[PDB]
Design a protein around this ligand. Sequence first.
Ligand SMILES: NC(=S)c1ccc[n+]([C@@H]2O[C@H](COP(=O)([O-])OP(=O)(O)OC[C@H]3O[C@@H](n4cnc5c(N)ncnc54)[C@H](OP(=O)(O)O)[C@@H]3O)[C@@H](O)[C@H]2O)c1
Ligand SMILES: [Ca+2]
Length: 186
Amino acid sequence: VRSLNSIVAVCQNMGIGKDGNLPWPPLRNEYKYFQRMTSTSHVEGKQNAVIMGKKTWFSIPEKNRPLKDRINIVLSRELKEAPKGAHYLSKSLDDALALLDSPELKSKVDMVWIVGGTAVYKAAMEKPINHRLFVTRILHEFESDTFFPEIDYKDFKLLTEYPGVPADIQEEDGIQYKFEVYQKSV
Ligand SMILES: NC(=S)c1ccc[n+]([C@@H]2O[C@H](COP(=O)([O-])OP(=O)(O)OC[C@H]3O[C@@H](n4cnc5c(N)ncnc54)[C@H](OP(=O)(O)O)[C@@H]3O)[C@@H](O)[C@H]2O)c1
Ligand SMILES: [Ca+2]
């Protein structure tokens, strides 16, 4: 596949989760952002693919599965078949990657989005492939039990601007955050 996209929201301590959920209470605007980014395809008749870990899939309220308008791929070394509502189950990122290149998929899919968790982000980041990382930096700390892996600042260059990503500091529910896009060129 040409390139990857990963999207995550992180707080000051690099936490991305707590007790099987997000560390902060709901932020509407950030959510819409996530939906818009992962769902929008730039080609008619095609859809985006989202890849996620087992825990992440299960963190989504059952009635909200799978993420509508995207091909949901869940990774697990343990499951024997895709969880109810998921489109495909893969045993590794590589497997998922191969799957995508498969004929059936290849023609059906526009963009690939990595939606976490930890181990998933890490694996995608290590692939020597063109990758864009969309980060929402929440400028506050919340107790977290799950964290974003460390990004190689030598590989991933922070863009100073990106089409359709606001530059300013955003605020909502008395909380501030900023969007940042990092890019790795292979
Ligand atoms: N802040 C944002 S945007 C965000 C995004 C995602 C998740 N989260 C949060 O983080 C937590 C879930 O993340 P996590 O890190 O704990 O768990 P996940 O990555 O979602 O799930 C871990 C499981 O997933 C499977 N897995 C993970 N990486 C794999 C790989 N490379 N190949 C095969 N299977 C792989 C394994 O399943 P098996 O054990 O069955 O093999 C592993 O036990 C929740 O709190 C969730 O809310 C936050
Ligand atoms: Ca396990």
